[PDB]
Symmetry: C4
Subunit: 277 residues, 4 copies
């Protein structure tokens, strides 16, 4: 209705970064993932895999202590900040990260918002998802804040009912990205990527294979890794949302859309990304 | 002998659901799986994988606390109700599920029957398998109750000896589905699917590759997921039993029937289901 | 030197069992595996996988309590007898098994020999490997006892030094199978399969890819499963040793012999077994 | 600048060992890996997999107690020395190993240097990586000591700043290999392999896919295994560094360089090694 343009294959091709011969892991940065709780452990593995698949140099996972041994056998490349998401409620981050994500598998509590407030005092892009999404405002800071709500979470953030939101998705997403001064990735079919400077795009990829628990946690991870290897954080977000949907389209060529498990998106990404190089 | 018809490829094709572009995980519902105990943990992973492979939107696994970390690395998409099957003995379910299964890897105890009684007060289809199968009757309720006995369990439910049962499988299964007012999936070669309204079918798929521990737990999961994405719960049951057997037939094209492990049925299902679309 | 014949492809083909349409898991029996200790946990997973791959109906793994959660995510089809190998020191088996193996990953202690003595009072074939192999004699019983020593273990059982053994492998293996009234599978290149009735064969398959920790534990499992689905326990042993070696030969077609991991033998067996049907 | 020659395909082909029909696991030795701590567990799995993939006969992993259950499901072929890296601080090794590696996932502490001092009294090649790398000297002993620093660790060992090092990598690496009387594998694009007798080579393989956490831990493991199956420990080091890089090149044929996870190097090695036979 606002004629929001699609982020197309040609855009993805023009903006995906190289991984030069002369580079080292430090070139691609260290990401911090604050995710996974004893009651919701899976989200940390889904987001960790998404992140390490997506071009970072190193990943530190600040998960609950009992979740760590569940990640190690599947993702032995990750390192840990034991109970990191809880500790981040109490102090500003001492270390420097290229990018930070918070929320997948975390409860919707005040202590999580305290961790968000401490994360936001860092100078790097920050992603807020799932339990870190709430009705709130954001401090002026250097790097972008990127909110990744599904329509239910957007309702929790804004009070726009889901049935009203879904009639004018790009219009509400743009309005609230402007108001909050955050990036908003408004999930669903034709995901809207709304920037606080008024740029806005639609994502043309993806299908109903994604309409299952865990696919959003994978995307959060993919955005986190992409923020580390793209110079322009806008291109990171756009490319992550695009390639995420493209992995689901690859799956449905020879597999039923009913049967995808989110972690498989991360297994498919290596081949899908290569096609856009 | 009663000329029970086979649920054929043509029936499966005509009744398998679409997964539309405009859908979200809520369209495909949340399933609850009450399965897995410290002594029999594997059943929860087999049934969880079967369920998440089979078109649901979300899965909550109410397993014993010590079983949770065994599922997470393999199925990080699942969420948990810690000690759920035990807690369900004490109270009616507060939350609303699209479908519920109970019994795989649970002991044949009175406390399991108490959990069954509480599950049955929900308005959704309910599957009873393994430890939840007993000699008992069922309350009038809205949604179907689906019993999935092998012949030994059918003997425990009815007192019909296995050697007598196996001579007239469809006749006993129909009689008892009518008497109990439950669906009965009477397992084995040519599994019988008997509905309490007197409809009855035979399953034409499957082979001896399935004659090994865990394949029934996988099927229970597959029925649970299919109940979430089919409008007609009859078609869910029939399609689950059919596709389960078809995965074993795909396996035996290039692998010996002696060597299948149940969890591999769930890995094969994505490709097998696609063939029937 | 004694012109011991090779168990050939033609023998394997003529003796491998069918898995009939009308069968159920009970047709293929329940195996018991007494393996894996806190200090040597891996052996239980290697042998469990070998066994469930090899045509049994059900597997009960009597492993140490802390080893159970290490097996479940990889082999959720197995069931458990918690601390089974330890408990078997104290009482005769109450339950009936189709076949039993003891020793992989168990210490060479008197308590393990006490468990062996209790196992031998069952009427089924029994495999003794690794920690269950000692200098001892065997009681007259119904079913075969099958010892699976490498040359070092054969030295521990008999006092024949390894350097003397390796000069006349079939002659020593036959002599001691006769003396002990046990089957002896004397491992190595050209493994000798010596029966106490004086039959003896050489195994023609296998290569240096097998010369690495864990491949023997896999074989023990494979023999256990094969004992459950072959009518003739001699053919089970021979076919297990043969197919084990054939999986290593398949591997070396496209992979270096230096790089095989034992568990991969079990992943290869499905395709290799099919070729001999 | 010093015209250091490349270790080429032709060198690799001429020096990779055979795995003879008549061999047994004892022919290829037992390696000891002292790696992995509660805070950095993943390194033990990465290095263990690298080592068991690389032609050893047996592997003993001396890791922290809580790390053991994280390795077992992925690498059930490994055995353990519980808290081995800690215990090695207190006594000389009682057992004989073909080769030893220490440091991946260990803290940079004095107690780790005490374990290094005890390891060095063994007569076998010893690899020092990660936390075992420090500014220190080395005792005259029989077998080679092999240091595997990235440029940051080389700075910690020598005080040559990274920006100065990277201008004259081979010159600094040769000078310090001579001074310390250690092998130095100076990591990065065109990794330098400098021997204390003044031989020096460059590695021609590898790419930016390797510029991510965990790839060095995999290499340490690969060197450890290769030391066990090559007669000449120089050829082991060179071949390990070469094949490690070649696995990353195979990956990038059909997968994006951004998306490799280190453990996958070990999965690729079987096929890559075969190509050089
Ligand atoms: N459209 C909608 N209408 C009404 N209510 C809605 C709604 N969408 C969500 N909700 C609400 O959300 C709640 C259910 O999710 P919820 O349980 O709240 O989130 P969670 O507990 O943290 O874990 P999840 O089960 O959600 O999975 P996820 O977080 O990994 O999925 P996500 O949505 O982030 O990520 C899913 C990912 O998959 C993509 N995706 C999903 N379906 C498609 C599709 N059909 N085509 C293309 N892409 C799709 C998304 O863009 C995204 O990237 C309910 O309360 C419900 O009301
Ligand atoms: N036919 C029979 N005759 C006499 N006694 C019998 C019997 N079948 C079972 N029993 C009794 O059952 C007990 C053994 O099982 P049991 O131990 O009681 O069940 P469990 O402990 O909960 O776990 P399981 O080892 O049974 O495996 P499962 O539950 O995953 O298998 P299920 O049967 O549900 O699921 C197996 C699945 O595989 C399918 N399947 C099995 N074989 C074939 C085949 N040959 N062709 C096509 N489909 C097959 C089934 O239809 C089903 O979907 C014994 O006490 C025995 O007496
Ligand atoms: N030939 C020999 N000469 C002198 N000493 C020897 C010896 N073989 C073994 N030893 C002794 O054995 C000890 C080392 O093993 P050991 O540590 O004692 O056994 P473990 O601790 O229980 O676990 P492992 O590391 O042995 O592996 P495994 O039990 O899974 O292997 P297995 O041998 O059962 O099973 C290995 C499997 O792989 C097969 N295999 C091995 N190499 C080949 C080959 N080259 N060609 C064909 N098949 C082969 C075998 O037939 C068998 O099926 C040493 O003390 C050593 O002295
Ligand atoms: N070049 C550089 N310039 C400035 N500072 C540097 C630097 N390289 C490293 N650093 C320093 O190192 C620290 C970061 O690593 P660090 O965190 O200190 O090591 P760790 O905590 O023990 O675990 P890691 O995250 O390092 O991964 P790894 O040990 O498995 O990787 P490794 O380097 O051993 O092994 C990596 C492996 O991949 C190979 N590899 C990496 N990139 C390429 C490439 N582009 N082409 C070919 N091979 C490559 C290497 O040769 C090696 O085999 C920082 O403090 C940083 O200052
Ligand atoms: Mg979400
Ligand atoms: Mg069952
Ligand atoms: Mg052995
Ligand atoms: Mg390193």
């Amino acid at each position: 209705a606002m004629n929001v343009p699609f982020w197309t294959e040609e855009h993805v091709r023009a903006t995906l970064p190289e991984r030069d011969a002369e580079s080292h892991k430090g070139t691609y940065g260290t990401a911090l993932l604050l995710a996974g709780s004893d009651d919701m452990p899976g989200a940390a593995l889904l987001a960790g895999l998404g992140a390490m698949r997506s071009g970072l140099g190193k990943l530190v996972i600040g998960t609950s202590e009992n979740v760590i041994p569940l990640i190690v056998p599947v993702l032995p490349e990750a390192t840990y900040w034991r109970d990191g998401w809880k500790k981040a409620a109490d102090a500003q981050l001492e270390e420097t990260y290229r990018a930070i994500a918070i929320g997948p598998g975390l409860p919707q509590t005040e202590s999580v918002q305290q961790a968000v407030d401490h994360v936001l005092t860092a100078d790097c892009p920050v992603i807020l998802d799932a339990g870190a999404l709430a009705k709130r405002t954001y401090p002026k800071r250097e790097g972008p804040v990127i909110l990744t709500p599904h329509p239910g979470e957007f309702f929790r953030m804004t009070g726009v009912p889901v049935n009203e939101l879904q009639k004018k998705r790009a219009e509400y997403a743009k309005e609230w990205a402007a108001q909050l001064q955050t990036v908003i990735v408004l999930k669903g079919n034709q995901t809207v990527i709304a920037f606080p400077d008024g740029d806005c795009w639609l994502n043309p990829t993806g299908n109903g294979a994604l309409a299952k628990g865990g696919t959003g946690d994978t995307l959060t991870g993919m955005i986190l890794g992409m923020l580390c290897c793209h110079e322009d954080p806008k291109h990171a977000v756009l490319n992550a949302v695009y390639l995420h949907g493209a992995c689901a389209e690859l799956w449905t060529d020879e597999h039923s859309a009913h049967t995808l498990l989110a972690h498989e998106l991360s297994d498919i990404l290596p081949r899908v990304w290569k096609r856009f190089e």
